[PDB]
Amino acid sequence: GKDFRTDQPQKNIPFTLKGCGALDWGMQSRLSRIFNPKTGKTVMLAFDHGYFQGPTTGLERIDINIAPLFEHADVLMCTRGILRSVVPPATNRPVVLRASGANSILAELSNEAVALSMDDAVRLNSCAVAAQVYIGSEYEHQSIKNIIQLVDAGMKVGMPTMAVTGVVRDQRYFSLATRIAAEMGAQIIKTYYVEKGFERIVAGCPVPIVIAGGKKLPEREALEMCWQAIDQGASGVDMGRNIFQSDHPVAMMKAVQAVVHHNETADRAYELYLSE
Amino acid sequence: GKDFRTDQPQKNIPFTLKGCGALDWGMQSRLSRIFNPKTGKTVMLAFDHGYFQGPTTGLERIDINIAPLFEHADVLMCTRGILRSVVPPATNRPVVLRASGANSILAELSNEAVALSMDDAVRLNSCAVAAQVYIGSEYEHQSIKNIIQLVDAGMKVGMPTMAVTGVVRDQRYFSLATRIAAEMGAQIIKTYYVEKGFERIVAGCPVPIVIAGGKKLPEREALEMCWQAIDQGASGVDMGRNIFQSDHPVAMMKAVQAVVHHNETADRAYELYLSE
Amino acid sequence: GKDFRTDQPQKNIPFTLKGCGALDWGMQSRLSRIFNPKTGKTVMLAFDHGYFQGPTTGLERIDINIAPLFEHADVLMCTRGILRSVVPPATNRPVVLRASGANSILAELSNEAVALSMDDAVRLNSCAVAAQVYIGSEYEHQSIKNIIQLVDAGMKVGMPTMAVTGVVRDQRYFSLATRIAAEMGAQIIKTYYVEKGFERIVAGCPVPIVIAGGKKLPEREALEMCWQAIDQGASGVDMGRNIFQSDHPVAMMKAVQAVVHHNETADRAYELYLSE
Amino acid sequence: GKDFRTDQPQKNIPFTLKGCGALDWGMQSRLSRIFNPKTGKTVMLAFDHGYFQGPTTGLERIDINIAPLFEHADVLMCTRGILRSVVPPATNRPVVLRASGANSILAELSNEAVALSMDDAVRLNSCAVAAQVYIGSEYEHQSIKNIIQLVDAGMKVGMPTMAVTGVVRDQRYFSLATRIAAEMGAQIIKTYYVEKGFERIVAGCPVPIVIAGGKKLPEREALEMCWQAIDQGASGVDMGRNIFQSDHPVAMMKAVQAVVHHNETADRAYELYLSE
Ligand SMILES: O=C(CO)[C@H](O)[C@H](O)COP(=O)(O)O
Ligand SMILES: O=C(CO)[C@H](O)[C@H](O)COP(=O)(O)O
Ligand SMILES: O=C(CO)[C@H](O)[C@H](O)COP(=O)(O)O
Ligand SMILES: O=C(CO)[C@H](O)[C@H](O)COP(=O)(O)O
């Protein structure tokens, strides 16, 4: 009384996420927590700015202002200090840990060291670990070594590494920064959007790219940036200020989600924003 | 231009999951992937039976019959063999790995060893590891050592361990089995439902309890068992046969969800089942 | 003067080998050395018999009789002893190492221990490690632990493990043995061909299956066995005696290749054998 | 009924690859994947340039432009980033991993660190690891330490190390750079071809030498360079730009193969190129 359905051979289901078709199950799994398998994109809520800036505007009280935003985000990005202290585990949301630091706004910005062991990243159930790369800055060499070290460590354990291109911001520059990081082994790259040439940054990069929100803009303009980035091949956005510094954070997020996952237009989305 | 809201002191949000209020963030995080933070319960789809039974009825073709069920489950339970081979990572669903084995239906059932290293559990992004405890069986001592070893290893890494009471099935017996496992350190206990006294099993166990589906029953009766268990304090169910051996697996799951998360009645639920 | 071809998005190339679509690059790479990416099959030349049998017939002088066969094989299977001593490295052919032993024909056949460290497997540039599983035998439990240990070790390093079902030989039996091994984590399973029901063994096994040659048969019959096995879904054969005990080894191998990779018929192939 | 052929004593088959006749089996095995045992030479397709140069011309889209070349190459050389992301494991071609980096075209070129752990090299099934040595540059000391560290690590595991002489380019200079690297332990040395004295570079180096393609040349001239190098004792070439920057990459590769493995002349080969 058994049915082995032998008339129908077993076939493998392809894993389509850009440049991640040759990774182990666990690593693909963590990546799938970050990039929605359906759309292949992500809306990432970033609040790690304090790691070298202290209580930056809008992030004075993560526990009050940012707490109510978690549920509306695909993934959270922050440090292990904040994570443990004020992000409730019950939030049940994927996290990407800031794993670099030891710099401040009072000194050389590019002077970063690895800020948490892979050991602890695993203890904290991370989906990924993130560090800055500073191409063209004084501590460029060290910043790349930080990426090398996180990748070496993450491959033992199936933890993805996200390289962030920290900074003249033109296409030829970001092409250089993103490609090197990818080349070194980072599975996710986060960079800035550029007025012209962005398409080339995406095309030249073998792995998923995510754009930073950047300094505060009018909500409508912020949404235009997102639409452009997505339309030109970005795999999602990593917003911080353009959300938590808005008068209507939750509304802004829903708009951003509309644009990223559902191919909404900048205008349509802005009207989704005006209804909240 | 900053607002520290100093008139409103920061307060810790309590973690209410039974007997898990004193664990590290990462472990609480993994637990919150299993047990819905809202309802505090879980509907677990179990298909690990093959680990000592080979191609058991209904599990001949996981890739065909079980594949379409994944999305309707809170968490998946299976071996690392099946996980890698036929469970697509894009399933984006929390997993609990069977971590014991080395036994078969052709020999002593209680003769189990640890079947995967914590190393590989982490590599596979697990939410927990599971192993059998056989109180009263020939290899009782070894089975408990399996639990001891998984907890020792899990605590370094923030991985919860689930102890399963494998087997006369009365209340006094399962009280003994579940309590000992909890006492050794397992964070989740999975046991069988009992006609009378089940409430005492839950009350005597300091951590969350989950019931096994058990042998195939008429759908209506299986739902009654769930309702009873939940009503008497279980934290969810770990169904296998009563789902994948049904003529309407997806329908049955929706029913079981209704009973577990939404306090549906056995009858009402059964009518949810008859509509699909 | 650069062309990023931004009109043409990058797409992942699927890895189609049965149940190996969720493995890291290096492991998929080693598997691709074994299973021809085009056909998805393998012809494996096995000469490890001496590991518990001593100088078995046909394998008295590997250096003389077997040496001239290597080039005609897809992959070699043998022990590290023979590998180092008489297989010339310049053979440039992928190897699968026998990694179990400590038994002999003078004692209990199922009493095997792991016979080489993963350390040394990596040192020898192996494509996989192989060990016996003895379901139903006296040392069944230990044999399965051997597989558990090799998988744990292999996963750290991207080395595949092949589980071999050592032994009444019917379908229900081999279904049990193969499925349990796969379930524990082995990426390759090698078993015996069966008169009836073989299709069910393949269908119930989530990873590639390879058949043993078995005791010497008339060349025409051996080819019929291969044809049946392949036709019913096997991923290749692991011949030993039916090749090296033939009066025309090289001829026989070319036949077997014809059947496995090129869908030749038993008869057509036998005529390929009669021309050499 | 056994034949031990005792009238014919067993004899060791010599391993002839220059200066590798005293290595363990595994290491000789990996070297044999790189240097064809028959000819003793190799045609190596190099596309690692991006590791410090970003999207260099011709390598904007490895996945499109370089993908179709793989099959026509003896061995692939690239970074672990590119390997995992866009080189399909099914390519079934030996790889040599770029294992240095942390420099860029925006800073001191000779400032390289080890870019991937031997751990991960083994995980990726490499045939060798490669790093730059910069004799005469500012970070000369560190670059040599990079070779020392890779050799120490490779010897535990049977992984060969390839030292690359990065840079006035005359014979006395490259003799110094190549000889030092070899002396430290590197089993493969890759250097540049020189108008006069190249023969002395080869003679003075105890292990196999491979030449870099160098900047783009007219196809006919590039082939002349290969012919000279081979004729004067090189063990193969590591082309990049002279292939992927050609209007007929595949044709060019076939030509190069002709010259390296089959002792074709520059002219004859060029006519092989004009027919494709
Ligand atoms: O902290 C940073 C890196 O050092 C980034 O500026 C930040 O994480 C990006 O998010 P946003 O610009 O949208 O606030
Ligand atoms: O495999 C088992 C333990 O050895 C269990 O029987 C199983 O996992 C429980 O699920 P169900 O009884 O609902 O099928
Ligand atoms: O050695 C063995 C396992 O203990 C097998 O019998 C052998 O390797 C299979 O090959 P063949 O039966 O074709 O000779
Ligand atoms: O990348 C390099 C070293 O830093 C080399 O220039 C390169 O790998 C050699 O190949 P080619 O000169 O033929 O392009």
Numbering used by the authors:
A (entry chain J), B (entry chain B), C (entry chain C), D (entry chain I): 10 to 176, 181 to 289
Question: What does the paper behind this entry write?
Answer:
While sequence analysis suggests that LsrF will function as a class I aldolase and genetic data suggests LsrF is involved in P-AI-2 processing, the details of the role LsrF plays in processing P-AI-2 are not known. To begin addressing this question, we have determined the crystal structure of LsrF, alone and in complex with the P-AI-2 analogues ribose-5-phosphate and ribulose-5-phosphate. LsrF crystallizes as a decamer with each monomer having an (αβ)8-barrel fold, a ubiquitous fold commonly seen in proteins catalyzing aldolase reactions.
To identify the catalytic site of LsrF, we determined the structure of the protein in complex with two P-AI-2 analogues: ribose-5-phosphate (R5P) and ribulose-5-phosphate (5RP). In both structures, the ligand electron density allowed definitive placement of the phosphate group and illustrated the general path of the carbon chain, but was of insufficient quality for unambiguous placement of all ligand atoms. As an independent confirmation of placement of the phosphate, the LigandFit module of PHENIX was used as an automated means for placing the ligands. The automated procedure positioned the phosphates in the same location as was modeled manually. R5P and 5RP bind LsrF in the same location, near the entrance to the (αβ)8-barrel with the phosphate group oriented towards the coils following β7 and β8. The phosphate is located near the positively charged side chain of Arg254 and is positioned to form hydrogen bonds with the side chain of His58, the side chain and main chain of Arg254, and the main chain of three glycine residues: 226, 227, and 253 (in all cases with N or NH groups). No large conformational changes were observed upon ligand binding, though there were small movements in a few binding site residues, most notably Asp251 and Met252 (with α-carbons shifting by 0.5–2.0 Å). The P-AI-2 analogues ribose-5-phosphate and ribulose-5-phosphate bind to LsrF in the same general position that other aldolases bind phosphorylated substrates (e.g. E. coli DERA and FBPA, T. tenax FBPA and M. jannaschii ADH synthase), suggesting that the canonical aldolase active site is conserved in LsrF.
